[model samples]
Target chain A: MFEQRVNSDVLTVSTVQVTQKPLRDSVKQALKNYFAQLNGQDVNDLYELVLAEVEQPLLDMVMQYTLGNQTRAALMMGINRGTLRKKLKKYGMN
Target chain B: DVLTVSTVDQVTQKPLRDSVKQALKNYFAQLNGQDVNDLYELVLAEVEQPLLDMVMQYTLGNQTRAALMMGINRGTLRKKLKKYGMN
Candidate 1:
């Protein structure tokens, strides 16, 4: 594995990039790898666990695309500025 | 470029839901001896954020149009956007 460092506002940024597949496919692969490593161990609250991991980056990328303009970003996200703020707060983005 | 063999069906492009299903299956397989909690909220938030962000990007940051595309009320959309801090 290449030693990669990512500097960003978001925490736990990784330098590795998966260029071969779409985001959905990469996520599938990631989850698969996670399961394989578990070696048949049981899991709890799988849905929320996976989602919590994925949502933060999804929002952060879109926000970056909008250049920190909440209004425009919200417009792009099709969400109200209020709700966006709440989510931001939830993830400590705000 | 590295050539990766396609595991997805060549005859039909994999639907988005299929990928999600694949991920869920992976999650089930990788439980690591723990029970999951608050799955609905977690999954919904994860999927919703990306879906909203992409649609907005596709519409070039146009709220009314994006809302129209998402089949949601503009006001409602605005609220969601704000909640995600995209606003």
Candidate 2:
């Protein structure tokens, strides 16, 4: 008998999806609030998305401040230099 | 996003004191949870107390480097310097 796998008929999802939305929204709201405080303007949606992407390095900056080195920032972030470098590049930062 | 420090406004540019105060307000909002109604008093105590104290602890209680690291102009830095009583 010839039988095929049901893989194509099934929808699969990862278990890591639950915590992402809250964390993402929290970050977005925080960035919006921070920008509002700094510049006194409501952020456009484009800026909101851009800020979300950049918050990684903003977090990196705080950690780097606390730790005082790029190596430590990479270590504390639990990301390799290549990955961190990619993020830093996207955010226009070191 | 780390803004272009040069592109900042002249009169509207916030110095370290004002910037840190705004930052602290947001940080406190993020800390919004049980048993912290006295926002200023609470934030005034726990949070950046470490960062501020240790810097003052060294250099026989000087903070010029800390001031410089804030990336503000010297005059603004001096104004905040007096406000934070680092004078």
Candidate 3:
């Protein structure tokens, strides 16, 4: 793994490059491996598949980081508390 | 007790959820600023761009195979592809 340190920002530093910051990397690799082994039967709404794959862990982490505190998770995720609650259930997250 | 266990590099390798958290914080810190824009679109696009690219490649540019795989109707797939301009 030829991992290198990333330096500056792009909102200021025009035409900068960015490595896949784990999340995007995960999704793409998830998709790649998904399609890779897809000699199997097919799948569902592709975007939702990716969304669910990434979002579940995101919600779970925020909730854990906030120690199951819904309000904090909501604020951190930049969504309303009600929406957070719904998403929590949407993923069957406790 | 006080959040110190976060320094887990000695026992590294992470989770999908953990990866999501890590990636967001990395970009979020980079993006610290006065006015943020539509985060849903901004962040969703991160995944969307790659998803679109990979699917088209996977389908070998065949809309029907791509649509079936994504479970989108052919028209919807075309709409989405066109919207992303990967059409």
Candidate 4:
């Protein structure tokens, strides 16, 4: 969260402006949009913990992309079949 | 989630043709999973919270409004807010 603030001001003028760019930067902008609105939030918000929390939707989208196949989904995600199944079980997705 | 539109880099630079597709693929390679390999987990780690956080912010922290713009039910959005601790 702290590492990418410089590029965050890459586009736009409002006190809370951010540009859409390389998808990662868009993600950065999205993060800034909330942090901007969240006036009292810390710049040092727990980065890894937020990463861990955000991954759920990413996983959902990825699984939908693969049509719920453990092997192929695992392939695209780069996880072993066994681990993929375990995650499906963990999320109760399968 | 939605590939909203083109970017400054997409137009000016020779960015990858489909950043999301390539990004997803690269994500698979980088997060190499053992307890570590789920692609979905990788994706989740990237964007879920802020997506909601920003949406909720835009709605002035109103759950129903955020849910409407996001095309989700109020209950579901509220549930998500709880899950993500945005509430």
Off by over 4 Å in 1: A1-94, B1-12
lDDT of 3 at B18: 48
Tens-digit lDDT track for model 2 on B23-81? Answer: 43344345444232222232222222332333234224544554443333457545644
| Docking band of candidate 4 | incorrect
* Docking quality level of the chain pair in candidate 1: incorrect
Residue-level error in angstroms, candidate 4, position B79: 2.0
lDDT of 4 by residue, A1-94 (tens): 4432111111111122553333444454645544565565433323333443344444565676557665676776666888767756665665
Q: Give the candidate order by descending TM-score.
A: 3, 4, 1, 2
- Using Cα atoms with residue i matched to residue i, what is each candidate's TM-score against the true structure? 0.43, 0.26, 0.60, 0.43
- DockQ of every predicted complex: 0.03, 0.02, 0.24, 0.09
In lDDT terms, which candidate is top? 3
Q: In lDDT terms, how accurate is model 3?
A: 0.59
Q: Deviation in angstroms for A19 in model 1?
A: 9.8
lDDT of 3 at B49: 64
Model 3 chain B poorest 10 in a row by lDDT: B1-10
For model 1, residues A1-94, the per-residue Cα lDDT tens digits are 5653321111111112322233443344444454455555554333344454565654565566557887866665566789778878987888
Q: Chain A alone, TM-score for each of the models? A: 0.64, 0.39, 0.65, 0.49
